[PDB]
Amino acid sequence: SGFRKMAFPSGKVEGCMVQVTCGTTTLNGLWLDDVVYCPRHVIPNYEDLLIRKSNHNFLVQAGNVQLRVIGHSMQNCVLKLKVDTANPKTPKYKFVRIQPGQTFSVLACYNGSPSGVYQCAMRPNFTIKGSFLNGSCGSVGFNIDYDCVSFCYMHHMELPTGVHAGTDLEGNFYGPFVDRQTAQAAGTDTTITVNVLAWLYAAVINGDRWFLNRFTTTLNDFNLVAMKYNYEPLTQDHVDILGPLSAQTGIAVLDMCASLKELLQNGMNGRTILGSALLEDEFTPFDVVRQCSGVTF
């Protein structure tokens, strides 16, 4: 029993964090094999600024050891610093681009040293509600599948509303954001419907069934209601993905949709679901199955 916001074990990622300095800016880098990946803003016409830099300008620090930069190149908004030493702690890894609604673990770092780990989700507006202070740039987001680390996010900046923006590991931003000081803001956000449904199924698994009712709904009627509450539209793929949870608990996905419809129109009425007075949307259907089965890494 118990349901918590759970992050992946961070150890395979801890062994990759380094500190990157160039002139006045100090931020974090990801050391994989003989290349260090970091945000290009550590150095705007980025190619004009980069052509003026020599390898010895970038000071790379791995623990107490200084690494020697032997080359440099830019890929989109990420800088790739070729170093003389291969990381002996390099894990089996991949660079993956995620979709909004998907979740991941964030290892927050300052000065190349990891300070904390938390779980979060890519919001439909392509921002993340993270916990970052100045010096956190270069912190990475990841998932683990058996022994392989899937790197999906690198932190670049904070928006005026306190939310965060960044790129995949190939330097492409999530969202209509750019890496410079300008007037930019997050768009209106929506609730991840498929995730709230998964979390209602997790509550049923943990013995919380007060919100269940005898009613069902059509997918079209549910989406007409959901659009009125700033909820993301629910697709047939979402319904198929919740299949296992629907068969395990005995509650059909459209049957659970009718419960969510009533929660949106009437509220919780002094009650909580899994210790929460709000409907939670940062657990995917796979996070629910993984936590209520015990998958190890």
**Which residues have a catalytic role annotated?**
41, 137
Select the binding partner of residue 276 from ligand R9I, its own copies, Cl ion, none (C-beta < 5 to 8 A, by kind).
Answer: its own copies
The residue range among 48-56, 116-124, 131-139, 275-283 that interacts with ligand R9I, by the rule CB under 6 A, is 131-139
**Angstrom distance (rounded) from CA 293 to CA 289:** 6
207 or 250, CB closer to its own copies?
Answer: 207
Question: What is the closest distance, in whole angstroms, from the C-beta atom of residue 22 to Cl ion in the complex?
Answer: 32
Interface mask toward Cl ion for 73-102; x: CB under 5 A = -------------------------xx--x
Structure tokens at 98: 């995620």
Q: Which of 124, 141, 123 is nearest to 132 (CA)?
A: 141
Which of the choices ligand R9I, its own copies, Cl ion, none does residue 180 contact, using the CB cut-off of 5 to 8 A by kind?
Answer: ligand R9I
Q: Let me know how long the chain is.
A: 297
The residue from 68, 94, 180, 228 that contacts ligand R9I (CB under 6 A) is 180
Element (H, E) at 36: strand 35-39
Of 259, 268, 249, 157, whose CA–CA distance to 214 is shortest?
259
- C-alpha 261: how far from chain center: 27
Q: Judge whether 179 and 156 are in contact, CB under 8 Å.
A: yes
Considering CB distances under 5 to 8 angstroms, the limit depending on partner class, which of ligand R9I, its own copies, Cl ion, none binds residue 216?
none
Q: Which of 235, 225, 231, 233 is nearest to 258 (CA)?
A: 225
Q: Rounded to an integer, what distance in angstroms lies between the CA atom of residue 273 and that of residue 43?
A: 47
The CB density around residue 46, as the number of other CB atoms within 10 Å, is: 15
Answer yes or no: are the C-beta atoms of 50 and 43 closer than 8 Å.
yes
Q: How far is the CB of 31 from ligand R9I (least distance, A)?
A: 21
Tokens 């680390």 belong to residue: 149
* Interface residues toward its own copies, by CB under 8 A: 1-12, 14-15, 107-111, 113-118, 120, 129-133, 135-136, 158, 162-164, 206-207, 272, 275-278, 290-297
Assess 132 for contact with ligand R9I (CB under 6 A): yes
Does residue 168 belong to the site contacting ligand R9I (CB under 6 A)? Answer: no
Which CB, 168 or 179, lies closer to ligand R9I?
Answer: 179
What's the min distance (Å) between Cβ of 46 and its own copies?
26
> Do the beta carbons of residue 188 and residue 150 sit within 8 Å?
no
In angstroms, what is the minimal distance from the CB of 117 to ligand R9I? 17
- Residue 102 binds which entry of its own copies, ligand R9I, Cl ion, none, CB below 5-8 Å type-dependent: Cl ion
Q: Tell me whether residue 110 or residue 151 sits nearer to ligand R9I (CB atom).
A: 110
Q: Considering only CA atoms, which of 223, 224, 78 is closest in space to residue 154?
A: 78
Q: Does 127 bind ligand R9I (CB under 6 A)?
A: no
Q: How far is the CB of 8 from its own copies (least distance, A)?
A: 7
